[PDB]
A paper describes a structure:
The acyltransferase (AT) domain in PKSs is considered the gatekeeper domain because its function is to recognize a particular thioesterified extender unit with high specificity and to transacylate it onto a downstream acyl carrier protein (ACP) domain. ZMA is a polyketide/nonribosomal peptide hybrid antibiotic produced by Bacillus cereus strains UW85 and AH1134 that exhibits activity against a variety of Gram-negative and Gram-positive bacteria, as well as certain protists and plant pathogenic fungi. The structure presented here of a hydroxymalonyl-ACP-specific AT expands our understanding of AT domain recognition of ACP-linked extender units.
The crystal structure of the ZmaA-AT domain, along with its N-terminal ketosynthase (KS)-AT linker, and 20 residue C-terminal post-AT linker, was refined against 1.7 Å resolution X-ray diffraction data. The ZmaA-AT domain (residues P93-S407) forms an α/β-hydrolase core into which a small subdomain is inserted (residues A226– I292). As is the case with the two KS-AT didomain structures from the DEB PKS, the post-AT linker of ZmaA (residues D408-P443) wraps around the AT domain and makes extensive contacts with the highly ordered N-terminal KS-AT linker (residues T1-H92). In ZmaA-AT, the highly conserved histidine in the GHSXG motif that includes the catalytic S192 is replaced with Y191 to form GYSFG. A notable difference between ZmaA-AT and previously reported AT domain structures is the positioning of the loop reconnecting the small subdomain to the large subdomain (residues I292-S298). Neither *malonyl-CoA nor *(2-RS)-methylmalonyl-CoA was used by ZmaA-AT, whereas both *malonyl-ZmaD and *methylmalonyl-ZmaD were used to some extent, highlighting the importance of the AT-ACP interaction.
Numbering used by the authors: 5 to 292, 296 to 443
Write the structure that this text describes.
C-alpha cells in the first residue's frame, strides 16, 4: 500500500521559465545528493494539493537515476515543457475505429490500474452473461496460447465487443483521474463508445448492440476499402460515372478532408482501380465497413436496435452521419443507427467543427497510429501534434503500456489538462517529503 506504480511522473511549474528551470535543476541535484529519497513520495509531493503555474515541465521515470538524468537537462527532448496560455482547455475524446486491436492490448493497465480493471471486468461479466463466451480469454489469454487468441480476435463477434470494452475502459480510467471530455467524436465504430459514455445507452445495451452488429457482419464476405486522395465532391462524380459504366456499386465510406475512402466487393474495387488508372489517379488499398454490402442485414439490425433503450446524450458529440453535433432526436432514433451503418462517415466535418476552437485538445482513445496522424493533419498541417495525445501503443511498438500512457499524460498536463491527484492516489499510501 506504500508500494507505488512502476512509473512515476515528476511535475514542476512556475510563474516564469527562468524560475522553472532553476527549480528543475535544484530537484535534480537534491535527488542526486540523497539517492535513496522515496521517488513515489517525491512525485506525490510535487502533485498533491499543489498550485499549478503557467510554465510547466513534466517527465516520466522508473528510477531515481532516470529522473536525475532528465532533470539535469531541463530542455532535453525527453522532458515535456509548455507555457500554458489557455488554462481551461476544451478536452475532446476521439474514439478509434476497428482495425488496430490486438491480443493483450492494455495488459499492463489491466494488471496495474484498479479503475481500468474494474471497468473491463464489468464489460467481461456482461458479455459472458448474454453470449456465454469468456471474452477475457481472448483479450488477455491465460489458458489459450497467444496464437489461438489472435485467431479468435479476428472474428468480428469477438473483435467488436472487445474493442468497445477496451475503449470504454480507457475512457473510464481517464475520467476516473478527472480528465473529462467536454465533447466527443468517434471514427466510424468509435461513435458507439462515444454514445455509451454520453449515456445514450447503458453499458449492457451497448455491449448487446455491438455483439449483434458483429454477429450480423460475420455473415458478410470481406470486401475491400480504397483510399483516393481527392475531395468528396470529386469522389461523388467518379462513383456516379463508375456505377453507370460498370455493373457494380462503390460506396463512399469515409470522408477524411482532402482524401476519401471508398469500399465495395473485390470485383467492384478492381474495376474502380482500373478506372482510376485510366484517369492517372493515385489510390491505395486500406482494407480493415460502411457500404452497399451491408444492405441484406440492415432490416435485422434495425429490428434489434428497436428493442434497446435509447436516451438523449448527456455529453455532446459529433455525428458521423451528418458531420455536425448529434441531435437528441437522432441519437434516440433506431433508424439513425441503421443509417450510420450504411452511410458515409463524415469524419473531417466533425473534426472541423471541434477545431473551431483551435486551442481544444484531443485525446485518442484506443490504438490507432494512422488515425492519430490523420487527425493531427486535419487540426493543423505544421503543428497539429501539439494538440493530440494518445493512450495506447500500436501492436508493433515495443514500449510499456503504462510508460506510453504516462508519457502522454505528462504532455497533456504541461499543455494545461488537470489531473485529479486525489483519485490517482486513491489506492496508495504516500507522504509529503521535504524538497527544495
Amino acid at each position: 500500500t506504500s508500494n507505488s506504480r512502476p512509473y512515476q511522473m515528476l511535475m514542476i511549474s512556475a510563474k516564469s521559465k527562468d524560475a522553472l528551470d532553476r527549480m528543475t535543476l535544484n530537484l535534480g541535484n537534491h535527488l542526486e545528493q540523497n539517492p535513496h529519497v522515496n521517488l513515489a513520495d517525491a512525485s506525490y509531493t510535487l502533485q498533491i494539493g499543489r498550485k499549478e503555474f503557467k510554465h510547466r515541465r513534466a517527465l516520466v521515470c522508473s528510477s531515481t537515476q532516470e529522473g536525475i538524468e532528465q532533470l539535469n537537462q531541463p530542455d532535453g527532448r525527453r522532458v515535456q515543457y509548455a507555457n500554458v496560455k489557455e488554462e481551461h482547455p476544451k478536452i475532446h475524446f476521439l474514439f478509434s475505429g476497428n482495425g488496430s486491436q490486438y491480443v493483450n492490448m492494455g495488459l499492463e493497465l489491466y494488471e496495474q490500474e484498479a479503475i481500468f480493471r474494474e471497468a473491463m471486468d464489468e464489460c467481461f461479466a456482461i458479455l459472458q452473461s448474454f453470449t456465454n463466451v469468456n471474452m477475457k480469454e481472448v483479450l488477455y489469454p491465460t489458458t489459450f496460447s497467444i496464437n489461438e487468441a489472435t485467431e479468435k480476435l479476428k472474428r468480428m463477434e469477438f473483435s467488436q465487443p472487445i474493442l468497445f470494452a477496451f475503449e470504454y475502459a480507457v475512457a473510464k480510467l481517464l475520467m476516473g483521474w478527472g480528465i473529462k471530455p467536454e465533447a466527443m467524436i468517434g471514427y466510424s465504430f468509435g461513435e458507439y463508445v462515444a454514445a455509451c459514455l454520453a449515456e445514450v445507452f447503458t453499458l449492457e445495451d451497448a455491449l448487446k448492440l455491438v455483439v449483434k452488429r458483429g454477429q450480423l457482419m460475420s455473415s458478410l464476405p470481406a470486401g475491400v476499402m480504397l483510399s483516393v486522395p481527392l475531395p468528396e465532391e470529386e469522389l461523388i462524380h467518379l462513383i456516379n460515372s463508375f456505377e453507370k459504366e460498370y455493373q457494380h456499386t462503390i460506396s463512399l465510406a469515409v470522408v477524411n478532408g482532402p482524401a476519401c475512402i471508398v469500399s465495395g466487393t473485390e470485383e467492384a474495387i478492381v474495376d474502380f482501380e482500373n478506372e482510376l488508372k485510366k484517369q492517372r489517379l493515385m489510390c491505395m488499398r486500406v482494407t480493415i465497413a460502411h457500404s452497399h454490402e451491408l444492405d441484406s442485414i440492415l432490416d435485422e439490425y434495425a429490428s434489434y436496435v428497436s428493442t434497446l433503450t435509447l436516451r438523449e446524450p448527456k455529453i455532446p458529440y459529433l455525428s458521423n452521419l451528418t458531420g455536425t453535433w448529434i441531435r437528441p432526436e437522432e441519437a434516440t432514433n433506431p433508424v439513425y443507427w441503421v443509417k450510420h451503418m450504411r452511410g458515409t462517415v463524415r469524419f473531417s466535418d466533425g473534426i472541423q467543427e471541434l477545431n473551431r476552437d483551435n486551442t481544444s485538445l484531443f485525446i485518442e482513445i484506443g490504438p490507432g497510429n494512422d488515425l492519430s496522424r490523420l487527425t493531427s493533419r486535419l487540426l493543423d498541417y505544421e503543428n497539429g501534434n501539439e494538440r493530440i495525445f494518445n493512450t495506447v501503443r500500436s501492436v508493433q511498438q515495443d514500449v510499456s503500456d503504462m510508460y506510453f500512457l504516462f508519457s502522454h499524460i505528462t504532455r497533456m498536463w504541461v499543455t494545461g489538462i488537470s489531473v485529479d491527484w486525489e483519485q490517482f492516489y486513491k489506492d496508495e499510501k504516500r507522504r509529503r517529503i521535504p524538497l527544495p
